[PDB]
Amino acid sequence: MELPDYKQWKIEGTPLETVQEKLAARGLRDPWGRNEAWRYMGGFANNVSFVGALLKGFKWGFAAFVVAIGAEYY
Amino acid sequence: GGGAHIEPRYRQFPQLTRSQVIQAEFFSATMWFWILWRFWHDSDAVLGHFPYPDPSQ
Amino acid sequence: LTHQQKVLRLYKRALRHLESWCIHRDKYRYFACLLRARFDEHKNEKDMVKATQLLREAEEEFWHGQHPQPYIFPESPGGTSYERYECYKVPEWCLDDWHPSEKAMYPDYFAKREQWKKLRRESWEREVKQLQEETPVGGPRTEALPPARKQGDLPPLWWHIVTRPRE
Amino acid sequence: APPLTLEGIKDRVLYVLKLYDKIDPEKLSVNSHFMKDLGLDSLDQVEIIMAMEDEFGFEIPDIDAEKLMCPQEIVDYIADKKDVYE
Amino acid sequence: ASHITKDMLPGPYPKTPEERAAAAKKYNMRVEDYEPYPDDGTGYGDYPKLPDRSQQERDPWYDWDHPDLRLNWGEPMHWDLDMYIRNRVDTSPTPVNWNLMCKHLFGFVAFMLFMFWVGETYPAYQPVGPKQYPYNNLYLE
Amino acid sequence: HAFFKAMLFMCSGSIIHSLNDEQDIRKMGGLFKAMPFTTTALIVGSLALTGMPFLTGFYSKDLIIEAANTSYTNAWALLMTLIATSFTAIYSTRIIFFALLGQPRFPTLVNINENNPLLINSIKRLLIGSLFAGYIISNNIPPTTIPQMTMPYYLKTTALIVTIL
Amino acid sequence: TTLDPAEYDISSETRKAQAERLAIRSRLKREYQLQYYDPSRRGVIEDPALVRWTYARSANIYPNFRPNTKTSLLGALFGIGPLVFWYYVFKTDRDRKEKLIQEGKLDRTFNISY
Amino acid sequence: MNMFSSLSLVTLLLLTMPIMMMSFNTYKPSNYPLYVKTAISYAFITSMIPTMMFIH
Amino acid sequence: MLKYIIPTIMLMPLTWLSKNNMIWVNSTAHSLLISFTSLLLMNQFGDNSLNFSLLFFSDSLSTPLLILTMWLLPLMLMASQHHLSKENLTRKKLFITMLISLQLFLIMTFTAMELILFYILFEATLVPTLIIITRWGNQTERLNAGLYFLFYTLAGSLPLLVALIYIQNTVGSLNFLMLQYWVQPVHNSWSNVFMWLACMMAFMVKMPLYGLHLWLPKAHVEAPIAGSMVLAAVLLKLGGYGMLRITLILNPMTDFMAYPFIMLSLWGMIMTSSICLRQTDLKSLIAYSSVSHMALVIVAILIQTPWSYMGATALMIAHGLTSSMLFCLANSNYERIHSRTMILARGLQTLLPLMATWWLLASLTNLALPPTINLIGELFVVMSTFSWSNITIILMGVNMVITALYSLYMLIMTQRGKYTYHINNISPSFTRENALMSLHILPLLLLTLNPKIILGPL
Amino acid sequence: TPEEKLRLQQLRELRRRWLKDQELSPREPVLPPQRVSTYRHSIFAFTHVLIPVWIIHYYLKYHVTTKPYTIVEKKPRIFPGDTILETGEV
Amino acid sequence: ARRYLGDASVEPDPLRMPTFPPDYGFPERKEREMVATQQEMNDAQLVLQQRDYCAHYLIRFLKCKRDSFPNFLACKHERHDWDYCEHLDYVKRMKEFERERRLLQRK
């Protein structure tokens, strides 16, 4: 019900949030960074990949492709 | 409402029903088995070619 | 439109048209104070043309590059599915003529109907009495006294007090 | 199809107080009136709801500025707009 | 049934301050950019003194417009200027009057010079001259 | 073609209801945010729309662009048809790169749901009927014309590489 | 392209005492809302902005009208104007079409309709 | 051979029936999309029968 | 007519003879009973021809046109009762009797056996119409419109008498259309122009050209109780058909000067429908639709050689049923909002759902959706004047374009909402409001099954 | 703003007060009132399709012998495999 | 079309031909022509642009489509042989510009 209890996110990963580190020569500084990093962190670094996503990992890429071939064949 | 069988979230990634992924992974296998007759056996152009018919005299 | 809130109505859209331009989420967020830095140049000074050149040159670089089909917040003056709930549209007080055996259903809602009308049918001895007094001759916007000094009934009663709910 | 109650709107408005690094979790709950620690003229009147501009953000018209001083007066008419609690 | 100031009269210089507003509050005190002087094009019977035309135009802007309604749905009291063409008006776009649309079809207008030629696949342009000979040169043998 | 978009409108129709409205290519996120089935159905038809490596309308698409091979055309027509095939490829990954790739960005209360078997009965019939459509239709049809069946060197198979780029 | 449409300009302090033009429309709205709310009306309000919109458009153009100009005598370029041109076309057909129909033939054997 | 189009006019005539029964001839316990979804469900398999008769 | 006139005069000493408020039910009861007898002996066969009895009837043989004339007295009494029931019974007995007295002369008209019996009955009207225009209207501009309805119809019709009496003592006698076997032709002269022109121009004043239509949005705009003679005045306009009786014979070979009647009525067709899209009076919106695709018959009669008479007859009773009902759609929905301004009636389509179908199936007959009696009428006119010159498909095609955008503009003004006002407008379109709105489309789409009944000779 | 502090706190005591009245299901106030009152797949399916095919055939076999043109069927499209040679494959 | 002589019957739709209309024909090697039987080509319901060469091999090819009715391939190798009938026909036609480029040069 109250799942976003504060002091939960507390930037540790989310390499998007190293851009706030980039402005250290500029300085803003503190407010605020935890808005866009709501669901940037967590288990949301799954983040499906290159052509292997449209291959779906090339998972069954040759699965029964060679398993059917072959017998009889005399 | 009446039935909360899929709950709302606060970005905690509500998951699947642990049976949808079976039908999901089943229809990637049926198409990459269907690359069978794409290569074995079907080539680029099964026609035969001409060997440059210059000597016509 | 005062000069105090002249920048503010431009300030809300200066970031709003920006976020339709980005592709990441941090791309907007890394540009947040960066967009604020140009806006924080002139902080505290006069109100004349000394400071109107913040605005008189804000036509360029805001209208120039202004929102190539931006995000529209779909329930809005524009944008899709904004005024779409209209096949129902809540035709409130269409319940005048029934020729009953159709007034059989909801016996309690028709019971509660005649109760609320006493505030509607009888408020004109009180609300319209001060309405000639509180409004001096022809003055600006016609809101009443916000409690009407004993009981605000309403003045907006009941078309703004019992208006159409959305679904 | 999903309904809503009034206990969720009291938390999200209160949470983005804590999400801002300019404001500590030591200010008042419903009425700090935003002048307790205002500044500037700009960016403490529209930026204070710029976080909810992304979250709730149903285009939030020009009237919404000076009513939003009282931080309970924000909570008042969000229930009026989106067809909310009883 | 209202007979006093039913409509206009043969104006538009019949002491214009008496018109808007005796009724028909187009102007406040005949300096409002809508005093009933605007008979533009006298000699035409159209638009007399007329709490009416050439007033500012192009839209009910069909948006927020929030005193309550103020534009086209919700009917304010006296704001009709000219209508029946304002059912679905628009506004200025991001560019203005760079007619690249006729220039967009001009690309095939240059490629109408490619309609003069043919598209034979075999062979290519063949830089020989009068040695292409697309149909026939000599007899059967 | 009739099996393509009545799938694909209905495929994305589960998505618009899933966020309850945006229908924008912005503010979407990645593919698998508990969306296993329809993203798998998206990468079939949008791969069919690439230009058919071995998919459904390969017997409709390839046989016509190689029916314009030997022709008396405008010679600006093949400079307008075959160039349009390359533009059909960036149609595919665009909805991938905004709705099926990126980090999850959209306003909160993730109210997604996909388990109504009315939709699951809908897609599972058409996706199976999609794949084996032309391999039954074109396999069982009277031929009415004489095919081309000639395509020499450096002029023949680049129409796939038109789609690859 | 139709039109500019002049969405920003200047002020402050060109004629700063121009205010209370809202006092006109607030007077109308205080007149209207007091008219619109009542417990027993059962019928529309007159609102003579419509009445002056029809009656100054339906009638009151011909009692207005004097032919003092030539831009109301412009209508001979618009009324009898194109009607001259449609006669010029239709007698070139049905005459050039007629001579070919009599001198020589153009239609075939299976022209029963017509 | 006489059943080539005799089964095909079944397809062009059956779809009129959920408009005829829409004029209140003792309608179903309501669920009215189910009546039409099953109305098409038998109209498809009738239409495919002369398609096989053509390809012979 | 053996005796169709003889029962319908017997309707007249039934109304005053009756009791109190029974006078509505007594008149509408018996008036429906003629519709069997009207059909009964008529529609017989059929191959050259049915001369009927005597010097009083040629039975309206090849142009039926008369069954529609007999629907209306049991169609208008149910329509007129909306705002009439505040006057005295002594005048309520009057307004039923002159309405029957208008149907009496129309019955001996359209059949008429002659050409001089036609005229005296062609002019036997316009006295009982004018009584319905001047008395029983609304606020003023009745009285000038009562005079614009005269002095066009009567200024033109008097040079008929100069020419019809001229024929009666030149070539035999005109008394029969079947003594018109001996017809001398009419060549090119300077007196035979005027014989053609005076005999024709009195028909143009009723079915209008683009010029001299100036009386048509006067009588229909300011109009009786609920379209009560406006339904009659649309039949009376198409009851100037007699150009089909005259010009087929009786100067047959003057097409030489048809051209100022063609181009005036073929370019006027494309403009007088275009000049209505900015109307603000709702009953004047329909009143210009009645100008446009009535004037398509004027280029369909003067162009001879059928495949046009196939269509020119079907167009006379195309909008005989359509434009009647559109006036009935506007004679209703004025009893509830007391203005005919089309702006004001918004917020609708939620409040009155059952009559949404009555708007559309009206306006779907101008779009005309080919299996009706409408696009079996236009597509014979189109395929006729194509064979005059090929270029006429352009103007007549743009005629089809603009009236598509024109008919929907009257529909789509009711699909809006929030209604802003209107504590009135409660009445949920009662049993009478749908009954007299029915019996229009119920014969209109019925006759599309076998429309061989609607055809000329041809 | 000091003015609407008194305002809009009574509006919730009017709007939501009516909206308190608006949510209304006491004792299911649809009466309806009066009155009363998978496997088969037997009478639902047989009534739909099986009856008109009996009808529409009857206006078809009794129709080809009446109208002087029935259905206008084409020819058999036969190859030389009945009474002719092949002849190669030369 | 190799002959340009008269036509006895006035039957259009160029079945009134010398025997059989080729695409060009013949022209050199061979200078001859020939095809199937025109009395069978009209007996077989077959459209134009199918009375060219390799028709008799195709008239026996597509017969097995019905002679093997619930089949997937009547003869897939003969389809590669009818294409080999077609490709040998077409490369015979491709030697135009091998000759016409050179035979139009001087000598």
Side-chain angles (χ1 to χ4, degrees), chain C residues 104-105 107 109 116 143-147 151-152 165, chain J residues 3-4 7 10 14-15 17-19 21-22 24 26 29-33:
Chain C
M105 296 186 289
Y109 185 77
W116 288 88
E143 70 270 11
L145 297 176
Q151 292 90 19
Chain J
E3 184 66 29
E4 68 266 19
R7 194 170 170 84
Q10 67 177 357
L14 292 173
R15 183 69 179 88
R17 179 65 180 87
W18 173 256
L19 191 59
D21 197 5
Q22 188 65 42
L24 189 140
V30 52
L31 272 72

Side-chain angles (χ1 to χ4, degrees), chain C residues 45 47-55 57-58:
Chain C
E45 62 189 4
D47 291 331
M48 296 299 170
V49 192
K50 184 72 167 66
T52 316
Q53 297 296 320
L54 187 148
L55 295 174
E57 292 292 327

Side-chain angles (χ1 to χ4, degrees), chain I residues 85 88-100 102-106 108-113 115-136:
Chain I
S85 66
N88 290 317
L89 54 85
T90 62
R91 290 184 291 172
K92 288 171 71 175
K93 291 177 176 66
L94 291 175
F95 183 77
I96 301 168
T97 53
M98 67 183 74
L99 189 151
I100 300 167
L102 193 149
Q103 184 177 1
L104 193 154
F105 297 103
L106 293 175
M108 292 301 292
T109 315
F110 296 101
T111 305
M113 192 62 203
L115 294 173
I116 194 64
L117 286 171
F118 180 73
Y119 178 73
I120 190 167
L121 292 171
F122 172 71
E123 190 66 28
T125 60
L126 307 174
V127 176
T129 66
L130 182 61
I131 299 168
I132 304 170
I133 299 299
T134 60
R135 283 182 289 178
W136 292 103

Side-chain angles (χ1 to χ4, degrees), chain G residues 32 36 38 41-44 50 53-54 57 79 82-83 86-87 90 93-94 97 114, chain I residues 255 259 264 266-267 278 280 305 307 341 344 386-392 395 420 422-423:
Chain G
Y32 182 75
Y36 175 70
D38 48 355
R41 185 181 68 192
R42 191 180 177 272
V44 304
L50 181 60
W53 179 248
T54 61
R57 188 174 183 176
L83 197 150
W86 293 109
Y87 180 71
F90 284 155
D93 288 332
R94 182 68 177 172
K97 188 177 180 179
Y114 182 71
Chain I
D255 189 74
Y259 294 162
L264 179 62
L266 185 61
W267 182 73
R278 291 174 67 90
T280 61
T305 68
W307 280 279
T341 301
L344 187 61
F386 187 81
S387 178
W388 180 254
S389 67
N390 301 115
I391 311 298
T392 62
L395 299 175
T420 309
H422 299 282
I423 300 169

Side-chain angles (χ1 to χ4, degrees), chain B residues 48-50 53 55, chain K residues 87 91 94-95 99:
Chain B
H49 294 286
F50 67 100
Chain K
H87 184 268
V91 172
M94 288 177 73
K95 293 180 72 175
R99 182 66 173 172

